[PDB]
Write a protein that binds this ligand. Sequence first.
Ligand SMILES: OC[C@H]1O[C@H](Oc2c[nH]c3ccc(Br)c(Cl)c23)[C@@H](O)[C@@H](O)[C@@H]1O
Ligand SMILES: OC[C@H]1O[C@H](Oc2c[nH]c3ccc(Br)c(Cl)c23)[C@@H](O)[C@@H](O)[C@@H]1O
Ligand SMILES: OC[C@H]1O[C@H](Oc2c[nH]c3ccc(Br)c(Cl)c23)[C@@H](O)[C@@H](O)[C@@H]1O
Ligand SMILES: OC[C@H]1O[C@H](Oc2c[nH]c3ccc(Br)c(Cl)c23)[C@@H](O)[C@@H](O)[C@@H]1O
Ligand SMILES: [Ca+2]
Ligand SMILES: [Ca+2]
Ligand SMILES: [Ca+2]
Ligand SMILES: [Ca+2]
Ligand SMILES: [Mn+2]
Ligand SMILES: [Mn+2]
Ligand SMILES: [Mn+2]
Ligand SMILES: [Mn+2]
Lengths: 232, 232, 232, 232
Amino acid sequence: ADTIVAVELDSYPNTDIGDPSYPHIGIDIKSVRSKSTARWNMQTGKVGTAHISYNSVAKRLSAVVSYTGSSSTTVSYDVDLNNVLPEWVRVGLSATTGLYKETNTILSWSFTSKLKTANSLHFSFNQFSQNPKDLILQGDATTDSDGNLQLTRVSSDGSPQGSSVGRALFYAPVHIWEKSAVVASFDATFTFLIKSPDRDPADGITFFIANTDTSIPSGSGGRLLGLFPDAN
Amino acid sequence: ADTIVAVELDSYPNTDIGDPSYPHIGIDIKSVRSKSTARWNMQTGKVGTAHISYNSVAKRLSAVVSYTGSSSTTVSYDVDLNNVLPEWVRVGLSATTGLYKETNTILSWSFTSKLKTANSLHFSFNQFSQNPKDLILQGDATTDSDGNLQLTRVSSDGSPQGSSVGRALFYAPVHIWEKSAVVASFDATFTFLIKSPDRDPADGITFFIANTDTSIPSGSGGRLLGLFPDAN
Amino acid sequence: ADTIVAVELDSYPNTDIGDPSYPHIGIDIKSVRSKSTARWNMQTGKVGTAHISYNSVAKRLSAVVSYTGSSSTTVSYDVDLNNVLPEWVRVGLSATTGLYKETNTILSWSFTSKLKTANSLHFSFNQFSQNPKDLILQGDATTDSDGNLQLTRVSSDGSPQGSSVGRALFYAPVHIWEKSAVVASFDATFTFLIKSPDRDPADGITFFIANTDTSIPSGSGGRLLGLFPDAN
Amino acid sequence: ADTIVAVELDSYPNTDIGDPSYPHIGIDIKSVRSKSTARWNMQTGKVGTAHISYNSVAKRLSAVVSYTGSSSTTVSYDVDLNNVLPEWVRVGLSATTGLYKETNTILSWSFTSKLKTANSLHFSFNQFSQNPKDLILQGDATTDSDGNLQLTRVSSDGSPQGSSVGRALFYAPVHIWEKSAVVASFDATFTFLIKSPDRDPADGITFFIANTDTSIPSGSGGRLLGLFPDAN
Ligand SMILES: OC[C@H]1O[C@H](Oc2c[nH]c3ccc(Br)c(Cl)c23)[C@@H](O)[C@@H](O)[C@@H]1O
Ligand SMILES: OC[C@H]1O[C@H](Oc2c[nH]c3ccc(Br)c(Cl)c23)[C@@H](O)[C@@H](O)[C@@H]1O
Ligand SMILES: OC[C@H]1O[C@H](Oc2c[nH]c3ccc(Br)c(Cl)c23)[C@@H](O)[C@@H](O)[C@@H]1O
Ligand SMILES: OC[C@H]1O[C@H](Oc2c[nH]c3ccc(Br)c(Cl)c23)[C@@H](O)[C@@H](O)[C@@H]1O
Ligand SMILES: [Ca+2]
Ligand SMILES: [Ca+2]
Ligand SMILES: [Ca+2]
Ligand SMILES: [Ca+2]
Ligand SMILES: [Mn+2]
Ligand SMILES: [Mn+2]
Ligand SMILES: [Mn+2]
Ligand SMILES: [Mn+2]
């Protein structure tokens, strides 16, 4: 299977697969069952910002998801990523809807990786082109006429659809560790807009890092956020 | 054919296709016959550094190739690139040898493109991996066990071979212009080592920007630096 | 006197000191009488963005001032800055009002200088603190309770005042050239808001680079944009 | 007194003030008595590199000091810096010698701070000017004719002197936290050369962050690394 490290913004509590009973953010290391989570007071219809960081000395993957003036939710997990992930990876955003639904709209995304002693990679998109040639769009993901990356299916009127999954990967593999590296670090930020007509919107957005040839796993819809073939 | 904009570090004077009669640096806009050139006092066996810059307001593509303490050769050409090139491009280095030869070794390469009003892309390599997954290596290009990108064929003992061509492209397409852009800029630097046993080494190195699906043209060896199908 | 290089966003045409007869942007090299200007369709009450760039190989100082969806005004001037300016400088924004007036509000400012072969400096402010300890505020300049840098005096109700001058300098000197530099480049962007009740607002905003110990010259009000002691 | 957070590269074990009995790196939060230390196999006469990072979500200040091919020493400490330090700070390097001595030569130094939701500051020096106008040199610190920052006194022949203290601060205050910040991060790297004729070289180098008006405390020589007025 793929190897996945992700920060999930999990709008829908699947308590039967170990979610806490409230929307949350989480760090997922090779499992949808987050190694650490924090309650997330999700604000439907407001633009959120997630900042994710790691470096290989501190070995603490952290994320903060905020909405202006209202909340900032943080979660951290200690982990040596460079023992979990392959040396080369692709980085991406995923999102799903399931029985319930929400827009999983990405308005901007930036990422920086540095490998020091050697390499760096930085990209940032404050809008997305109609044909984002440097994105690998998987499943339902497309960019819309406003320049937004719609991870999951939305109709022409902007309404979200259920049973959707989409991911966008940055086109270049990222060399996130090498044997002779002194320290490897990455930072990612994206802003997102989750709107939903559903009382319990679902399912959420992740920023994820995986093997380069990552693809949406069969069976990864809904609660598995397009990342995992099962809930193990 | 491809659309090519390049800065060439042209070690070998092909005066029959319009080179000046001395090694030179040049700016090539859709032709091997540089729109502008400057004499280049090439220093075989010393590590050189090239810095190339452009922005769409100034519309002046400039390059400087230097060697520590000995020379700095500059060439500039006024050109609206964003009318020459497609909106999406790949950026790359090329090099060739022909009847005569030289190592066309790249020790580091960095590139930054920004599109403002929106996007940026930056990569830098101070060494290259044995399997540079974020490079598209074309023709003869490989990375060597010292971490160098050898654009053209070198033998196990490091000796350069003739009739070689190689290019390395950055894996991600780069969005170097969009209609609604206020200004688009790029900068590139690479350091290189050209060694040769030949009295008149050849043929040279370029940094080039092309259509995304650029490939080495048939017939582009030697004097055409792996960039053009002919000398027109 | 100071040595000044500036890009002026000159809202008020002082045709008696060589302004064109319309609002314009200009590049000023040691004189308020711009070496080059472009007509600027100034949009009072809308937020503008200026991007200024230079590098010492291309030797073309360029600026573009835009407002979203309405205009982009560009001006360029060929000049070897590193023969005009001292090796160390301070960079700043200035603005003035005179008999007529306008707000000269700066909402963000970023600047990057690189000296290559060696040094870089980058700062960016997307809002300004109540006590911007890394700004040297000269004359009337202050930051306001919205986080804006008000270059020239505004009253508590936000109304601009006449006969005002203010500048903000970045606190650190910037080493913008050294003898052994291969190339020196800088980029600056700032966004600004010029509002005025006056039919002919005045006087304008500049981004400027000067000797480190630059101060507002006596007599530099109004048309001289806080930069020059006279109109020579 | 000043408020000091530092990463110390402590070449000399002052076990009477709580040093471990071997050269070490340490994180010091308002005390010379490190909150955390790691054994440092100091390599006199070889160029070392220190990378220090922090961000306010992870709240883990980490440092790694390495020498090519021989060692990489890491130390981390969990700490909410933005509760320890003032919102505005100066960042600097310090070094001392005492009864014993060593060169505390800085060959390069870079620093990046970002405050997000807003501001960033980055500087890097790969050599230092004879008159580093953007450094506040305190005590003995000077730059030498090779472009190195000699924190502590060295004679014309390059030999280190005892009873020396010197610091260099970056000239601009750095806004490292604000109430409304979502996350604040900083990274610093410097490379250094510690040479000594002494069997037990002393005393060490730090990178430190302090109140803006920080100055070398009286009594801060030798073991107190120019940072603290006493060993408490
Ligand atoms: O809201 C999105 C969620 O919808 C689905 O599961 C259910 C959520 N509420 C339910 C109610 C009834 C039944 Br049966 C099902 Cl499967 C569900 C599942 O598809 C989950 O994986 C997904 O996270
Ligand atoms: O040195 C590299 C050069 O070698 C070739 O051409 C010649 C260079 N010197 C010559 C001498 C004789 C003859 Br015939 C030829 Cl084709 C050449 C050609 O292959 C050129 O395109 C290339 O630039
Ligand atoms: O609007 C700002 C301008 O106001 C002043 O000059 C005048 C602008 N309109 C005028 C009308 C009459 C007279 Br007298 C004067 Cl000095 C002026 C001068 O202060 C100019 O330097 C300044 O640019
Ligand atoms: O080597 C540098 C060290 O020299 C000094 O202390 C001594 C180190 N070795 C000693 C031996 C004897 C005596 Br007395 C003293 Cl004070 C010392 C002190 O100055 C320490 O603060 C400093 O770290
Ligand atoms: Ca869930
Ligand atoms: Ca040639
Ligand atoms: Ca004027
Ligand atoms: Ca000690
Ligand atoms: Mn979850
Ligand atoms: Mn040529
Ligand atoms: Mn003017
Ligand atoms: Mn210690």
